[PDB]
Ligand binder design. Structure first.
Ligand SMILES: Nc1ncnc2c1ncn2[C@@H]1O[C@H](CSCC[C@H](N)C(=O)O)[C@@H](O)[C@H]1O
Ligand SMILES: Nc1ncnc2c1ncn2[C@@H]1O[C@H](CSCC[C@H](N)C(=O)O)[C@@H](O)[C@H]1O
Lengths: 377, 360
């Protein structure tokens, strides 16, 4: 196989703390690090973890197209790959969510035969679910870029969540150092008034970027967005959450064919209610059957089929090492058997299970389950 | 008031996908409650705090999921009511397709206790990274599979579609050996009514151990009816269904507001684009002459200033002290310059930039 690789990782949204353990370990093991982050504390942190770093942010400019900048950023990364080096690229948030240059660079490295991988990170939408206290599963989530939303006339749903990114950059294909003018914002507000109506709520969301700050979670009407004191608050790191207008009725034919309710009855919420919806009929946390479930806790014992963790220090140490040390992981992948034979202090059962590497084998080893094959080691 | 509840995630891939902040809160907690599906991750949590309880033991065969979730949340909230700092830990992102966390946080908040969710890496985040797609182009619709069929939720054939919980269509129960997915054919019918019979559906399973590869298998909608294929769909399975066409642009909107590489590899019958077109080659040529613009501000900080900003993100106690009294905290940090102390005291992002980029 060819020598040289590209791994792209994220930093998360909130400064330093939202970086993953694996992103940190790949930054440290890199021969060379390229980064694009909007926070000085996060930049300073990255520089303490590797001696060979380059700031990609310097390739943005006034009156220079974003597409030119991304071609340049990706070419800087892949040139170092072609010289045989293990390269790491670092971007704000999740490095594949609204990020052009990472997908470009990974696809180039892949087509020329180099190992190429993206590691996921915490996105702005992840932070939004956490701070606004909503689940994308109830009642579904539609996610769009605000200009693409308008240009391609993409459909909304009044019964599901709607999230809109780049609401502070409506129809802007350029970069500007000192911020922008969001003069085309009014085209967006008209569209929202059409689809939802004038008194419908819209939450202006800004996740805290520094660990001491609070999130902006300010609820407005769509009509309030036309007032200028409110419009100027919207900027480059702003997101809109639009709650549902109403609950959608159940399809009676499907509820039958999946056989959940008997005929003759009706399906008329679960606690807690979405706090941001209009006209929300409040739900009680301690209903009668919740209280019976809580009373059963006194005589609760684990069911027979429950299997408690029953591992060793040596096995836990090696599985942790594989997740936190990329070079150890690389060595394991090249030859399972040899790596397994040289781990200190493992039992024969543990060696054989690590040699196989399969999920059922690691579980047998770490939960002390009988395996005919593994107990004979 | 004494007592708090913080709920955190572990991510999807064992250990490595936990955030730095999630780990620091696990370590500082008085009591820890966890629900994870990987023994290496469970073992790692138990080395980081001496007072942990496994919430997975409250599931059972034939026992309602809702009863289990009421129990999980009450166990957490009972410790908060004794004035303790409590941490709950869930797989992935702890508020994405997870009931008990939302319930416990809302109960804690309604009784006057400090309550917060910290985000984590979800199964959808992994999907974007492993399938090499971006939800921005051309939009993403995300549903729970049963809710998708019961409420007859709309498909958008011009956008990404992601369906969670495809391996248990119509099932409210738990079972330790999993369930047979016998109502699966009701999902497939709805997919073929909406997309073609030859339209691709990608069966996605993110790797759970660090050495494993993801499942990214492309099938047709029709070949989901084959029984050898349908058995592979289980409790950690997710479906990605790519767009069937490109949506037309709106001529009116374009007036008022005044393909590109790489292509989505899963869309049927899309010609791949050239990576190095002449506009790209001209972009690359300018790198030989490139100097940083006059408005570019390089990092110019001290060791003392960087150490304190790192400490506020990695040490929950130091953060609490700082929030309580900005001035007193700033005065007690050793080796800061007078400028660095005043900036920490204000604490606004513009102030911190001044100190750490030595701007005039
Ligand atoms: N602090 C914040 N709060 C809310 N939304 C934010 C944000 N920072 C960035 N965003 C959203 O993301 C867009 C920037 S593009 C970069 C997004 C990043 N890759 C991610 O993982 O989210 C903005 O237009 C905005 O809509
Ligand atoms: N390894 C994996 N790969 C793909 N999808 C997964 C997965 N593990 C869980 N899921 C998805 O999530 C559902 C479990 S619900 C819990 C999801 C978790 N909190 C998260 O953040 O993702 C499953 O039915 C499946 O659709």
């Amino acid at each position: 196989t060819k020598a040289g690789s590209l791994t792209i990782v994220g930093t998360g949204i909130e400064s330093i703390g939202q970086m993953t353990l694996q992103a940190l370990s790949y930054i440290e093991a890199a021969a060379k690090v390229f980064y694009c982050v909007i926070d000085p504390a996060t930049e300073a942190f990255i520089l303490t973890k590797n001696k060979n770093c380059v700031d990609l942010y310097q390739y943005y400019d006034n009156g220079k197209s974003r597409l030119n900048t991304y071609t340049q950023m990706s070419e800087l990364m892949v040139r170092e790959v072609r010289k045989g080096l293990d390269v790491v690229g670092v971007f704000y948030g999740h490095p594949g969510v609204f990020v052009n240059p990472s997908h470009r660079a990974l696809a180039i490295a892949k087509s020329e035969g180099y190992r190429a991988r993206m590691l996921p990170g915490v996105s702005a939408e992840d932070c939004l679910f956490a701070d606004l206290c909503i689940d994308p599963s109830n009642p579904g989530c539609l996610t769009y870029e605000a200009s693409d939303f308008l240009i391609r006339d993409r459909p909304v749903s009044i019964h599901s969540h709607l999230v809109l990114f780049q609401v502070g950059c409506v129809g802007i294909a350029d970069f500007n150092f000192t911020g922008f003018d969001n003069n085309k914002f009014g085209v967006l507000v008209d569209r929202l008034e059409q689809e939802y109506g004038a008194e419908h709520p819209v939450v202006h969301y800004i996740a805290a970027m520094m660990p001491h700050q609070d999130p902006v979670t300010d609820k407005y009407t769509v009509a309030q967005l036309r007032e200028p004191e409110i419009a100027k608050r919207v900027g480059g790191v702003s997101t809109f959450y639009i709650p549902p207008k109403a609950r959608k009725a159940s399809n009676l034919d499907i509820i039958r064919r999946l056989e959940l309710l008997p005929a003759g009855q009706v399906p008329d919420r679960i606690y807690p209610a979405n706090q941001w919806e209009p006209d929300v009929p409040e739900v009680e946390p301690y209903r009668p059957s919740d209280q019976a479930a809580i009373a059963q806790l006194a005589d609760h014992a684990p069911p027979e089929q429950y299997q408690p963790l029953a591992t060793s220090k040596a096995m836990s140490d090696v599985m942790t090492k594989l997740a936190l040390d990329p070079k150890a992981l690389a060595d394991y992948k090249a030859d399972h058997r040899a790596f397994a034979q040289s781990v200190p202090d493992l039992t024969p059962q543990e060696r054989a299970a690590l040699e196989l590497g399969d999920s059922w084998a690691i579980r047998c080893a770490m939960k002390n389950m009988p395996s005919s094959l593994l107990d004979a080691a």
